[PDB]
Amino acid sequence: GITGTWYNQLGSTFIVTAGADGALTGTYESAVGNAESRYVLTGRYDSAPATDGSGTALGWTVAWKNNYRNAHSATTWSGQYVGGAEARINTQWLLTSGTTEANAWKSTLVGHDTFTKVK
Amino acid sequence: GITGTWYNQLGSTFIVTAGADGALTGTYESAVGNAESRYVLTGRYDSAPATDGSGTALGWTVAWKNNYRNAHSATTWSGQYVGGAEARINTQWLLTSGTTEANAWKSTLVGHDTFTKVK
Amino acid sequence: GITGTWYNQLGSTFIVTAGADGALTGTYESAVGNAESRYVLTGRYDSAPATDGSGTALGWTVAWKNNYRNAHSATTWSGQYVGGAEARINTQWLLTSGTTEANAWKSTLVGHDTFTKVK
Amino acid sequence: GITGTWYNQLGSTFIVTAGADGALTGTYESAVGNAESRYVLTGRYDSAPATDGSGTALGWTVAWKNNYRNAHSATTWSGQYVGGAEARINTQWLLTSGTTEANAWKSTLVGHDTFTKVK
Ligand SMILES: O=C(O)CCCCC[C@@H]1SC[C@@H]2NC(=O)N[C@@H]21
Numbered sequence: 001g002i003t004g005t006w007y008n009q010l011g012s013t014f015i016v017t018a019g020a021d022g023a024l025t026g027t028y029e030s031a032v033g034n035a036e037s038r039y040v041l042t043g044r045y046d047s048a049p050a051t052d053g054s055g056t057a058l059g060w061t062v063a064w065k066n067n068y069r070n071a072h073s074a075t076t077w078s079g080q081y082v083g084g085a086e087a088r089i090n091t092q093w094l095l096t097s098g099t100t101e102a103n104a105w106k107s108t109l110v111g112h113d114t115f116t117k118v119k
Numbered sequence: 120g121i122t123g124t125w126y127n128q129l130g131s132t133f134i135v136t137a138g139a140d141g142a143l144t145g146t147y148e149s150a151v152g153n154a155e156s157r158y159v160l161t162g163r164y165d166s167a168p169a170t171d172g173s174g175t176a177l178g179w180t181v182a183w184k185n186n187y188r189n190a191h192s193a194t195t196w197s198g199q200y201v202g203g204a205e206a207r208i209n210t211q212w213l214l215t216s217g218t219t220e221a222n223a224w225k226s227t228l229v230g231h232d233t234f235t236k237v238k
Numbered sequence: 239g240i241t242g243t244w245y246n247q248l249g250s251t252f253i254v255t256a257g258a259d260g261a262l263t264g265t266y267e268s269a270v271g272n273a274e275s276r277y278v279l280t281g282r283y284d285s286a287p288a289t290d291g292s293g294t295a296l297g298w299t300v301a302w303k304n305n306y307r308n309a310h311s312a313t314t315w316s317g318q319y320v321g322g323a324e325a326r327i328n329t330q331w332l333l334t335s336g337t338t339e340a341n342a343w344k345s346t347l348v349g350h351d352t353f354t355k356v357k
Numbered sequence: 358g359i360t361g362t363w364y365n366q367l368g369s370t371f372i373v374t375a376g377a378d379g380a381l382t383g384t385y386e387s388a389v390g391n392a393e394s395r396y397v398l399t400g401r402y403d404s405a406p407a408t409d410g411s412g413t414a415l416g417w418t419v420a421w422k423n424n425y426r427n428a429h430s431a432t433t434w435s436g437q438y439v440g441g442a443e444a445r446i447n448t449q450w451l452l453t454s455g456t457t458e459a460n461a462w463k464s465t466l467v468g469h470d471t472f473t474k475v476k
């Protein structure tokens with residue numbers, strides 16, 4: 001149930017296709033920051049999750065460069081998919097910017113996004 | 120410069136190929152945890168980084184499932200590549216395990232790996 | 239408006255007293271994990287925040303040991319207080335457990351809690 | 358063993374005293390960022406750690422405001438103390454800045470510091 005179009009609390013749009021062997025591919029559009037239009041994303045997910053009530057672990061990356069801009073940074077989202085009447089993807093992310101070795105201590109931002117199918 | 124074989128402080132193996140369109144593909148071998156043999160990885164990087172002293176932002180994902188074992192989890196590495204005689208990849212990572220809704224608060228581990236390029 | 243009794247999405251109870259010079263003191267009671275009853279907490283906060291619409295940065299620590307149990311770990315919450323008709327404290331935390339140097343790679347959990355005054 | 362003067366890889370200074378009730382108090386001096394002189398710190402640690410080869414869990418907070426400067430932010434260090442001839446404190450930290458509700462997604466930086474005890 002991972003395949004589809006998802007939105008997070010910020011209005012960003014996440015469009016993924018989950019492959020049978022565990023691949024994630026699609027595009028991401030951020031509603032905030034130095035970003036414009038769509039960006040390519042790639043990731044992986046557990047294609048054979050536990051039988052109990054556990055969620056499905058997954059993660060994907062986005063390098064913020066496309067035909068319009070390049071913010072010289074990348075974000076990785078790590079979390080888990082929870083199915084049901086109202087499916088959700090709960091994640092925590094790391095946004096690393098390219099920096100000089102002198103500013104490397106303040107290169108990574110951390111946060112959390114929650115995706116649902118309701119625009 | 121990113122393309123090659125790398126190893127982190129734990130003795131883990133990272134073999135990657137950086138595509139011209141910003142894609143990263145390869146395999147990862149962890150020296151620790153519930154894992155064995157090689158796992159597929161996919162990521163993205165900044166294919167047009169700043170021509171200054173800044174690092175190259177990148178990130179990649181590994182879902183801990185192959186033809187031999189499944190740990191129902193996924194790790195994402197976010198960081199930057201710093202070129203030169205002694206090429207290094209400094210990262211911070213998030214490892215999320217699939218869990219029941221009740222144990223969700225303790226599903227994500229955080230850490231940091233430093234990779235050194237071989238030969 | 240920081241002083242008072244707060245609750246997070248897990249049902250945990252946070253009781254703080256903000257001192258004029260920026261000190262935070264109180265007790266914490268977790269609704270989950272190897273915890274029982276109240277634990278002492280101490281922290282700091284910006285006692286002279288910006289004039290614009292910015293929140294108030296703050297943070298506190300809790301070592302999980304009291305008269306009843308000792309989980310040999312500590313959590314630090316870092317975030318910001320947002321006042322108004324419906325005040326909230328948005329945070330992200332790091333839970334570090336004491337471990338052998340061999341398991342140090344999986345010693346820290348990361349998450350996020352949102353506190354409000356509604357039990 | 359925790360009580361003393363420490364320094365991290367950035368050249369920052371950490372002077373702390375570990376109380377018998379699990380309390381940590383002292384001052385911190387950062388070698389980088391929008392800060393100058395000493396800042397008050399407070400934290401907690403496990404005063405009854407495991408008698409094995411495990412580290413001692415601890416954490417502390419610093420709100421970046423003193424009688425000379427105010428950066429409207431707060432950092433929390435979470436980690437463990439490892440005793441011996443070469444005592445070390447390995448940490449991971451969260452630095453949260455006060456921001457308007459619109460810039461909240463980029464309010465928290467994440468990193469890691471390693472402290473070495475002097476003399
Ligand atoms: O501005 C920057 O520093 C980089 C440009 C991209 C910023 C978008 C970030 S990624 C995490 C967060 N989730 C989301 O949906 N948008 C933001």
Ligand SMILES: O=C(O)CCCCC[C@@H]1SC[C@@H]2NC(=O)N[C@@H]21
Binds near residue numbers: 149192194214232
């Ligand atoms: O055991 C588990 O919970 C999951 C499988 C093992 C995960 C290994 C982790 S990934 C981050 C870290 N870097 C590395 O090289 N090995 C560890």
Ligand SMILES: O=C(O)CCCCC[C@@H]1SC[C@@H]2NC(=O)N[C@@H]21
Binds near residue numbers: 302
């Ligand atoms: O079980 C453990 O590993 C340690 C015992 C304490 C666990 C409580 C954690 S702290 C972060 C989170 N927020 C909250 O309110 N409760 C949990």
Ligand SMILES: O=C(O)CCCCC[C@@H]1SC[C@@H]2NC(=O)N[C@@H]21
Binds near residue numbers: 391
């Ligand atoms: O500039 C700011 O945004 C805040 C004031 C400077 C903060 C310094 C940070 S705290 C974590 C890190 N460790 C250290 O020793 N110095 C840096």
